[PDB]
């Protein structure tokens, strides 16, 4: 009614000029990152360091999901849009806390296995009356802002090979809606595509890595890039990787957009490109002309990527003084553990400093190239990878407060040990090849020896000019949520252990907190409605680490929590180690290999891990393990994302899996 008409009117106003005008005072949060630079800085200061202790719950909304929720809500004139699990979009009237509409693309649940890292979505984009979502199955869908009905869709995977999915938020720059995809763990060729925002007509496409060099190159950037790959490994079969699954930003004055590119496929550099090569444009920040998609320049953060070191993590465009001169930069802290400051007018390196311990490089030289540590490229034997695949910083948003000059950065360590699988062949699944049973192709072996580093999680306030930490708050677990900062001198961040917390932006002192029940991964947003400031966070534990581990005992549905000074709304709202399953201990080794090939990256290690948004097999009732075939072949949980292993497991393979599951629980029992 009133909500639908308000929604139509509010979203109709969203365009480039609107996003710029929203800068002087930010009453709305029109893009997932507030502005095109994606600073995630609100200029609102009604909630400030002196009164944030009086925040209370204004309302909460049930997203009804059970898997990860990674999106920051966007809000214009009190009308909120946020996605949940399986690409479902919700439009919420913040004045009542009630649903306006829900759009469910009805993703085939049997395809949950096609993505490496949970069935997530990092948000929607708004533009001239429509809401855009990148769906799991490859559709870019434009929805009517008032009704949630589809206006148009594009099958963005048409004609492209491999296990592609979409998890990121689209961006709309100058009337073109742009989206990438995920899949480099499986073997795909990364690309982004731009479509007309009004009609959906395809406008341009840019691939981040070259195709078969015996075929015409799509553009000069591809011909140039081919000179940095060794064709003896036929990289184009597996695809090469380079997926752009998360960060994109835009500078309208420079008429330049920027995209972070992903890791190599397969992960092992010696397998992917045998004789060497930087493998452009993997692991880079790339600048493109937003109108034509044409390459302008790039800066490669990790040449010869060999550890799943994506550069897709969220960058922030900022204007800061360095060496006493004004510089227009890009701030970026990707998985590899270095905080980069780059010149956004030309891609020139300014500085890089590690923000956590690292063991693949000792630093960057004066030309902006890493100085490698040899052992890290020795794939012939197990080697701890620090930061490793989970990343020193993953997609969880960071934020920049220009008044303190600090970047509030979620940092962590999840120990992993890697070595190369020199006998890997693309799509040839087999025992011991990690998750190959559902299409992964990393060409690595994991934890052939136990990693030695210790896990950690902390919120860093990083000074990009001095390239050092101004303050740090230690958390109990890795995989804490994204951040928000505001002119009220506060920083908001949810924790893996189940709280939304506000800290003083200058000191890191904790000023306020509330429980969220489940661990939080998405970053909050803030906005004004009828003269009052609200802070909202969409809570749904998940993402790749959240599939298998957790730091709260409690599990519940995805929920948007919204706080205001004085709110009074009421808040909404482990196990036994498996024992007794009959098994043959002699089959534990065979079961270990079959389990690593088919189950580990969703169910974790039985008993050792406790379960995240997917339950751990070492804590299930014995009936599930005693009767395992009932569950792995066209099981009752297919509708929830448990794959069908028909044609993948046979004979006595399930008995071997039982032996590994009960045997591992028996080995660690106190
Ligand atoms: C992620 C893509 C998965 C892979 C790979 C495997 N499993 Fe799974 N499983 C997954 C989900 C999302 C679920 C449902 C969780 C819920 O209850 O909501 C499951 C569930 C199971 C179960 C319980 C079955 C049931 O009907 O309740 C079992 C026993 C199980 N899965 C076993 C299992 C094994 C042995 C796998 C490797 C062969 C395996 N799963 C892979 C997701 C994923
Ligand atoms: O290589 C890829 O294409 C790809 C895709 C995605 C994804 O789309 O979410 C992730 C990753 N890689 C990845 O390396 C990673 O650490 C990761 C974590 C998460 C998550 O949502 O928690 N997604 C992804
Ligand atoms: O790269 C991935 O898809 C994830 C990150 C952690 C392990 O595998
Ligand atoms: Ca990856």
DSSP string covering 458-515, please? EEEEEETTTTEEEEEEEESSS----EEEETTTEEEEE-TTSEEEEEETTT--EEEEEE
In the chain, how long is the greatest CA-to-CA distance?
71
CA of 82 from ligand 2 middle (Å) equals: 20
Query: Which residues does 353 contact at the CB level (< 8 Å), separation at least 6?
Result: 338, 339, 363, 467, 468
For residues 647 and 455, what is the distance between their CA atoms, to the nearest angstrom?
A: 37
For residues 273 and 356, what is the distance between their CA atoms, to the nearest angstrom?
A: 29
Q: Among 390, 442, 546, which is best to mutate for testing ligand 3, by the most ligand atoms less than 8 A from CB?
A: 390
Token pair 């997203």 is found at 63
The edge-to-edge listing of strands for the beta sheet with 55-62 is: 55-62, 559-565, 532-539, 525-529
Residue 395 among known ligand-binding residues: yes
Give the single-character DSSP code of 293. Answer: -
Q: What is the domain extent for residue 625?
A: 576-670
CA of 298 from ligand 3 middle (Å) equals: 24
Token pair 């709260």 is found at 552
Give the single-character DSSP code of 315. Answer: P
Looking from the CA of 166 toward its CB, the CA atoms found within 13 Å total 30
Q: What is the 3-state secondary structure (H, E, C) of 93-140?
A: ECCCCEEEEEECCCCCHHHHHHCCCCCCCCCCEEECCEEEEECCCCEE
Q: Are residues 224 and 318 in the same domain?
A: yes
Q: Are residues 639 and 550 in the same domain?
A: no
Q: Are 482 and 72 in contact (CB under 8 A)?
A: yes
Q: Are 208 and 286 in contact (CB under 8 A)?
A: yes
CB count, 10 Å around CB of 617?
Answer: 27
Ligand 1 atom nearest to CA at 636: 26
Q: Are residues 442 and 590 in the same domain?
A: no
Determination technique for this entry: X-ray
Ligand 2 atom nearest to CA at 310: 14
For residues 624 and 611, what is the distance between their CA atoms, to the nearest angstrom?
A: 15
Determine what percent of the chain falls in helix, strand and coil, rounding each to the nearest 5.
15, 30, 55
Q: Which of 510, 541, 575 represents a domain boundary (last residue)?
A: 575
Quick one: which H or E segment has residue 626?
Answer: helix 622-626
Q: Are residues 321 and 429 in the same domain?
A: yes
Q: Are residues 563 and 552 in the same domain?
A: yes
Q: Are residues 474 and 597 in the same domain?
A: no
CATH number at residue 661: 1.10.760.10
For residues 143 and 132, what is the distance between their CA atoms, to the nearest angstrom?
A: 6
For residues 242 and 496, what is the distance between their CA atoms, to the nearest angstrom?
A: 29
Q: Are 42 and 519 in contact (CB under 8 A)?
A: no
CA of 386 from ligand 2 middle (Å) equals: 17
Q: Are 38 and 89 in contact (CB under 8 A)?
A: no
Q: Are 492 and 509 in contact (CB under 8 A)?
A: no
Q: Are 61 and 560 in contact (CB under 8 A)?
A: yes
Cis peptide before 199 (omega within 30 of 0): no
Angle at the Cα of 113 (from 112 to 114), degrees rounded to 5? 90
For residues 547 and 541, what is the distance between their CA atoms, to the nearest angstrom?
A: 8
> If you take atom 9 of ligand 1, which residue's CA is the nearest one?
642
Instruction: Give the distance from CA 366 to its chain's centroid.
Output: 31
For residues 174 and 326, what is the distance between their CA atoms, to the nearest angstrom?
A: 27
Query: Which residues does 647 contact at the CB level (< 8 Å), separation at least 6?
Result: none
Q: Are 596 and 434 in contact (CB under 8 A)?
A: yes
Selecting among 15, 118, 251, 308, the annotated active-site residue is: 308
Residue 249 among known ligand-binding residues: no
> If you take atom 27 of ligand 1, which residue's CA is the nearest one?
637
Q: Which residues of 441-465 are buried (b: 16+ CB within 10 A; e: fewer)?
A: bbbbbbbeeebebebbbbbbbbbbb
Q: Tell me, yes or no, if 230 is annotated catalytic.
A: no
> If you take atom 16 of ligand 2, which residue's CA is the nearest one?
390
Structure tokens at 410: 């979620």
3-state secondary structure of 238: helix
Q: Are residues 570 and 646 in the same domain?
A: no
Breaks (C-N over 2.5 A) in the chain follow: 573
Whether the CB of 656 sits within 6 Å of ligand 1:
no
Q: Which of 513, 547, 575 represents a domain boundary (last residue)?
A: 575
- Give just the sign of the alpha carbon dihedral 369, 375, 377, 382: negative
3-state secondary structure of 265: strand
Residue 272 among known ligand-binding residues: no
Structure tokens at 218: 């799509």
Give the single-character DSSP code of 352. Answer: E
CATH number at residue 535: 2.140.10.10
Q: Are residues 609 and 558 in the same domain?
A: no
For residues 598 and 620, what is the distance between their CA atoms, to the nearest angstrom?
A: 18
Task: Report the domain count for the chain.
Answer: 2
Ligand 2 atom nearest to CA at 262: 1
Ligand 3 atom nearest to CA at 310: 1
Q: Are residues 487 and 589 in the same domain?
A: no
Q: Which of 575, 609, 627 represents a domain boundary (last residue)?
A: 575
Residue 552 among known ligand-binding residues: no
Q: Are residues 547 and 643 in the same domain?
A: no
Q: Among 601, 609, 612, which is best to mutate for testing ligand 3, by the most ligand atoms less than 8 A from CB?
A: 601
What single string gives the DSSP state of each residue in 48-74?
Answer: -TTTGGGEEEEEEEE----S---PPPE
Q: Are residues 492 and 550 in the same domain?
A: yes
Q: Are 469 and 463 in contact (CB under 8 A)?
A: yes
CA of 445 from ligand 3 middle (Å) equals: 13
Ligand 3 atom nearest to CA at 390: 6
Query: Which residues does 630 contact at the CB level (< 8 Å), separation at least 6?
Result: none
Q: Among 107, 165, 545, 642, which is best to mutate for testing ligand 1, by the most ligand atoms less than 8 A from CB?
A: 642
Residue 335 among known ligand-binding residues: yes
Whether the CB of 185 sits within 6 Å of ligand 3:
yes
For residues 3 and 10, what is the distance between their CA atoms, to the nearest angstrom?
A: 10
Q: Are residues 487 and 620 in the same domain?
A: no
Q: Which residues of 121-135 are buried (b: 16+ CB within 10 A; e: fewer)?
A: bbbbbbbebbbbbbb
CA of 105 from ligand 2 middle (Å) equals: 21
Token pair 């731009």 is found at 194
CA of 184 from ligand 2 middle (Å) equals: 9
Token pair 């680490």 is found at 545
């Amino acid at each position: 009614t009133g909500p639908a008409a308000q929604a139509a009117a509010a979203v109709q106003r969203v365009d480039g000029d609107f996003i710029r005008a929203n800068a002087a005072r930010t009453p709305d949060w029109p893009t997932i990152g507030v502005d095109y630079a994606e600073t995630r800085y609100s200029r609102l200061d009604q909630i400030n360091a002196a009164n944030v202790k009086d925040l209370g719950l204004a309302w909460s909304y049930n997203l009804e999901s059970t898997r990860g929720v990674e999106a920051t809500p966007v809000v214009v004139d009190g009308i909120m849009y946020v996605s949940a699990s399986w690409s479902v979009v919700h439009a919420i009237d913040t004045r009542t806390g009630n649903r306006i509409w829900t759009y469910d693309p009805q993703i085939d649940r049997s395809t949950g296995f096609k993505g490496c890292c949970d069935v997530v979505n990092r948000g929607v984009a708004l533009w001239k009356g429509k809401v855009y979502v990148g769906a799991w199955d490859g559709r870019l869908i434009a929805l009517d802002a008032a009704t949630g009905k589809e206006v148009w869709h594009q099958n963005t995977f048409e004609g492209q090979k491999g296990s592609l999915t979409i998890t990121g938020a689209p961006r709309v720059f100058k009337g073109k809606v742009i989206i990438g995809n995920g899949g480099a763990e499986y073997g795909v060729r990364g690309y982004i595509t731009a479509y007309d925002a009004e009609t959906g007509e395809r406008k341009w496409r840019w691939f981040s890595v070259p195709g078969d060099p015996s075929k015409p190159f799509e553009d000069e950037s591809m011909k140039r890039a081919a000179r940095t790959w060794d064709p003896s490994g036929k990289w184009w079969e597996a695809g090469g990787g380079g997926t752009m699954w998360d960060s994109m930003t835009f500078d309208a004055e420079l008429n330049t957009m920027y995209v972070g590119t992903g890791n190599g496929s397969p992960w092992s550099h010696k397998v992917r490109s045998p004789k060497g090569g930087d493998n452009l444009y993997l692991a880079s920040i790339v600048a493109l002309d937003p109108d034509t998609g044409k390459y302008k320049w790039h800066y490669q953060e990790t040449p010869g990527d060999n550890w799943d070191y994506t550069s897709t993590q969220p960058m922030i465009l900022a204007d800061i003084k360095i060496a006493g001169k004004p510089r227009k930069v890009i701030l970026h802290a990707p998985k590899n553990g270095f905080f980069f400051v780059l010149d956004r007018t030309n891609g020139k390196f300014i500085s890089a400093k590690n923000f956590v311990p690292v063991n693949w490089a000792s630093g960057y030289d004066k030309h902006g190239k890493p100085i490698g540590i040899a052992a890290a490229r020795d794939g012939s034997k197990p080697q701890d990878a620090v930061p490793g695949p989970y990343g020193a910083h993953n997609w969880h948003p960071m934020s920049f407060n220009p008044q303190t000059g600090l970047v509030y950065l979620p940092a962590q360590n999840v120990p992993v040990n890697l070595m190369d699988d020199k006998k890997w062949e693309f799509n040839q699944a087999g025992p011991g090849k990690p998750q190959s049973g559902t299409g992964w192709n990393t060409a690595k072996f994991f934890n052939a020896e136990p990693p030695k580093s210790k896990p950690f999680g902390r919120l860093l306030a990083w000074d990009p000019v001095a390239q050092k930490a101004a303050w740090s708050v230690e958390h109990v677990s890795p995989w804490n949520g994204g951040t928000l900062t505001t002119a009220g001198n506060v920083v908001f961040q949810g924790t893996a252990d189940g709280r939304l917390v506000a800290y003083h932006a200058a000191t890191g002192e904790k000023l306020w907190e509330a429980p969220t029940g489940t661990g939080v991964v998405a970053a909050p947003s803030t906005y004004m409605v009828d003269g009052r400031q609200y802070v909202s966070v969409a809570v749904g534990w998940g993402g790749v680490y959240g599939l298998a581990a957790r730091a709260t005992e409690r599990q519940g549905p995805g929920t948007v929590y919204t706080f205001v000074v004085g709110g009074k709304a009421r808040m909404p709202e482990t196990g036994q180690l498996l024992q007794g399953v009959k098994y043959d201990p002699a089959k534990v080794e065979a079961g270990t290999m079959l389990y690593v090939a088919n189950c580990v990256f969703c169910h974790g290690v039985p008993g050792v891990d406790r379960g995240g948004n997917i339950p751990n097999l070492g804590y299930m009732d014995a009936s599930y393990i005693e009767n395992l075939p009932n569950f792995v072949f066209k099981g009752p949980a297919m509708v929830r994302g448990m794959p069908d292993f028909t044609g993948k497991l046979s004979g006595d393979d399930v008995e071997s899996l039982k032996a590994f599951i009960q045997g591992t629980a028996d080995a660690i029992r106190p």
